[model samples]
Target: TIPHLAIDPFSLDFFDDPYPDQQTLRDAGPVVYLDKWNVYGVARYAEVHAVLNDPTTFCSSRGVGLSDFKKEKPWRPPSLILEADPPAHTRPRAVLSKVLSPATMKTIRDGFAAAADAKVDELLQRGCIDAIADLAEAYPLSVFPDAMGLKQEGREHLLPYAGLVFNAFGPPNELRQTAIERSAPHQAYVNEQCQRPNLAPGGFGACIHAFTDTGEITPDEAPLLVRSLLSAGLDTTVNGIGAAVYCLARFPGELQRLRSDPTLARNAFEEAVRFESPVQTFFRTTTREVELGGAVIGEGEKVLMFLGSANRDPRRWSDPDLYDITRKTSGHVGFGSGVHMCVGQLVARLEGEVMLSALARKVAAIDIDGPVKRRFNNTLRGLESLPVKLTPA
Candidate 1:
């Protein structure tokens, strides 16, 4: 029989400190039933990896939230890339792949590095500052929007809009409700930003619109795809970078290792992602009656995969809880897995690598200067404030 737990993974209690509960879930079995939400959860790496790879069985098309699209109306039109499966997903995926491809990173690497250097210079001048507000949020906002061709006025709305999108993945709890209410203006601004007119020529959003010329996607579909980019891009990288700074602060030895070999900055960021898992959970619905983790799940059932827990699962990663920049974190599901893996991952990695490398090159030490304030979302895990004093190299 499948093990049952009445844990509300979305509650503030779980958000306050999730590791112990995640450990309990992972230890319970491969598949644990959460009766509180009436959903099945896979906490171990094996099951989460298996389910993500087998999207044919555990599909994303029904909606990645607790609400199944088959029965309920979606709050917004579903994402062409995030909410679609297979044939529906293929074209939009291809468009996004090209828009944010590795080749594109080559052209932007110098720009990213230069922006990172400027941010680092600013941080060094301050000496003691909120790493989240100053470095993590500031750096990405500086580069990414310019890359996407967004104007400067209302850029602050991006994070709240992201909160709305990620929280919508969970059940209609107070978190989701509050986010939805507060995000109305932010959501509208994002909607406007996705339009081709708002997007500067040669930018990512405009690049997507240009796909219509090649007939890959229609003009009507292009903005939605851009909307998808805006939805997933900003908040994840903000959290990813925050997680890295937090990790390095707590583990000074690792920061020293990074300083010793500045080239390890990329790996340090990757290990930080694997260690903290900024994007915590995503739910996939079972398409048909299928067996998973020694239990049976019927069609239309929601199966939530704990990406954070899976990345830390000892069965798959030896000393998984330890933060090792040298660890080969290739298979970690921090950016997700399989066909629906994060489309903007290259951009995220580029941001992480550039920012960390800049810090490694200039900063001798990162010491936590104040109490860390965590920012809790239903699906994203990161800090709201991380005050750190940096020693110049």
Candidate 2:
């Protein structure tokens, strides 16, 4: 008989701050049966990593979101790349890999850096600003659409649409409702822009349309593929920028270290990703009956991988709770692992490194003037507002 263990993935208290519950899940076992949601969970680093890497046993086709792919409900169409396994996921992944290769990324590097610097210069001139809105939201919202070859006419809705999609990964609740309502009007415009004629000629979206033209991917699949990028790309980077700023402000010594050694900017951004893990938890379904640390996870049931919990798991790192810039965290699940790891991670990293370095160069120090509010969302560990005072270097 299977052990009875249940837990609601959508408890308000858990959503508000999840660290304590994450600890409880980790302590419960390597794999705990979450009876409430009829799912299982792997909270520790080892088991979670195992689950993420082994796509054969734990396929992604069932939908990475909480809504089962079989159900065909609200989240019926999963991202072709993000929610697919090897054979099916291969083509799109290959196209993206080529398009966003390191050399291509290098081409964008200097210009992105200049853009970041310009934004920082503008923000510094303002003395104090809500770092989340003014700087964090500003940088990505300003540059990414242009890079993707999207027009500015309707790009403003990207972040909120992305946020809604992220929240929809969890149970339907106020946050999810709010996101859907906010994005209702823009949904049509967003969908329309995915068409071949609507896409910018040389942008990433246009490249996807080219795939459709070449019969690499169907014309029907083109928009959804572009939608995947717009959905996953926007909010994650926005929250990431906010988190990096919050971390540097909170740890001035680390900020100074980065300022002293400009090359440390990449490390600083990566460390911040490891420390905060802006995209927190994502779900996986067990393909077969598996036992982990003496607990049984029955076949075909969902399991939530608490990435934020694993990032700070005491068993994994020394002083796990403390955010350290120098820690070797390359194995972190921030971009995830194995087959479904975030494909656009390099793009996100470049944005963060460029922007954070720009900020460090301009500001001697940064401090928070008031309490920072955490933005409650099912999947994203985000900030609502981060008021900051920047001192010029």
Candidate 3:
């Protein structure tokens, strides 16, 4: 049996500023039964980190959302990897790891950096702009599609589709409901793009489909592998940029730290991720009646792991809430841990490193010019509009 509390982690109020609620949840215990959502939650660092690392006992195959795919009609096709566990999860994971490996990144890194530099050049021309729309959203949208072999025609759908997919992770709330309706029109186009014929030869998408030629994955698995890219690529990279920008604007001394060492661009991005986790929450289903935090969570129960909270938990990190670019963020779960970790994380980090490095070189300062409206999703945390004023160096 588990202790029950009436806290709604998914509520709009909770989403608006989760730090306080995170403290409450962490203070209550390592694990708490949320009567509001009828779900178990772990917000303390050690327990949350441990659960992410132990995917065997806490499986992902059932579903990573509140509504288990085993129990309900899925919002979309199950992710070949993200919503899967070992063995069934192995090959597709291999296909993607090879596709997005650091070796592959080396081939694209220079081009990516150039794109970042160019985007920053455009931003400096207009000193004040919405960093979320202008830089955060624009930079990735401009580059990732070409890399993925997606055509330019329906590119706008990528963000909406990504948003909707992440939203479905929570209970059927307004965010998930609205995301579903808005993303419907784009589904056909997104699915169609996953086909090999729709992908360009030299791009990552085409490479994923080509795995079929090598007999690494089934013909059916090829497109779904590409679907992983389409679903995971853009929005997280976009939010990674947004969160980094928000952190820099909020912490001016950190920006000075960044400018002092332009080489710390990648460090800045990784620090921001640990400081402000963009992909906040993930659910892992218990594979058996397992005892945790001195209580038993029944088999098949959805256990929500608060990635954002865990990153800032005082037990595992010193001065946990402070933003320090110099901090080593190796163990942070912002991209997750274990076998089900974010597959496109290397690529996301590339985008962040490039964008921030370019900005640090030329931008004298990043100042918050106006209010920021946080973008709401069941699983993702980011901004809708970040009014920022950029000063040229």
Candidate 4:
């Protein structure tokens, strides 16, 4: 039996800062029926993990947004990988998984590391910088397009476009409306990039087309998969890198700890991801009646899983709010879990490690100089602008 949840999980207040509301839901019960969205929500770490991992019972095929896929036309076609389930989801994920395999990532690690070193040196010369614009956004904007074989034009639109798409996953509120209006002009360019002819040979985009050639997916289906990369990849990584900087700056001791042992770059990135999850909440539809944490969920009800809340759940983590570099956060759902876990996690990890390691080596201390402005999107948590003064070592 689920208790009635008084708060609307999809409201702007929840979108702006959900940690407090997450705690409220967690205290209320495991499964709370949100009257506004008419969906059930799972707030605790254990139950959220179960819902995200168990796709057989909690399917994503109906979509992972507030708007039910069964009733509404999707703003864009569903992601081939992220929105797909078993059998239909298997082949494309398997093919792309190989492309981003550990071996392939290993080969490119040094290149990314060197790139990061150079960028850090450039920023250090300036003495003080907006870490997000200069370092966080810089690294991935440099490498990811080239890696995907995308010819860079209107690349500035990448972050905003992703911002809108992710926000659209929630209720049509002012935040979502603003993002949609801002992204309207760039939609054409994004679509154009998905075409086979527009894509460069030997790029990820082209490789997706190759899959179509081999009859792995329809020619029409191939572009949507490539679009998924565009929709989900860019802004999340930019904000993720920014969040890492924020974590290091706030926790000065941790920065010193990471610099003393450079290998902790990976751990630092993971910890930062856990501390402030870039992708906050995702929805899963119940396929049948399910029992979780003593609450029963009816079939066809949507379950909103707060990744941010789970990351900070006191029950699951010690000193949950504190950012600690030494903590083993391997199991955290920063990149999600189970089969639909982020396939490009290796790429994101490499970028994070490279950029953060560069900062750790050069800066003796990083201090926030002004108020940090947050860009509010329903699904993504990101700093729009963070002013900082870096003291060089």
lDDT of each: 0.92, 0.81, 0.89, 0.82
lDDT of 4 by residue, 1-393 (tens): 678877876676776677788899888887788887788888789988988889988888888888778888877777788778897898778767776778868766887789888888887788678887887788778777776778877777777677778888887777777777777676777888888997888767787788776666778887787887788767778878889999998889999998898889988998889999988889988888988788777788888888888898888999999999889797799899998999888888888988888887888988988787777778888787788888888
CA RMSD of each candidate after superposition: 0.9, 1.9, 1.1, 1.7
Model 4, which residues run further than 4 Å from truth?
Answer: 10-12, 213-215
**How many clashes show up in model 1?**
0
Residue 77 error for model 3, in Å? 1.7
lDDT by residue for model 3 over 1-393, one digit each (tens)?
Answer: 456888788898988999999999898898899988888999988898889888898998888889887789888889889888998899889899999999989989999999999998998888889999999999998889999988889898888888888998889889888888887677888999999999998899988977787767989888888988998899999989999999999999999989989899898999989888988998999989988888788988999999999999998999999999999889999988988788898999899999999989989898888988988788888899999889999
Candidate 4 residue 17 C-alpha distance from true site, Å: 3.7
- Top candidate by TM-score: 1
Clash list (residue pairs), candidate 3: none
Our model 2 lands, by Cα RMSD against the true structure, at 1.9
Candidate 4: the clashing residue pairs are none
Runs with alpha carbons beyond 4 Å of true place in candidate 3: none
Query: TM-scores of all models?
Result: 0.99, 0.94, 0.98, 0.95
Candidate 2 at residue 296, lDDT? 73
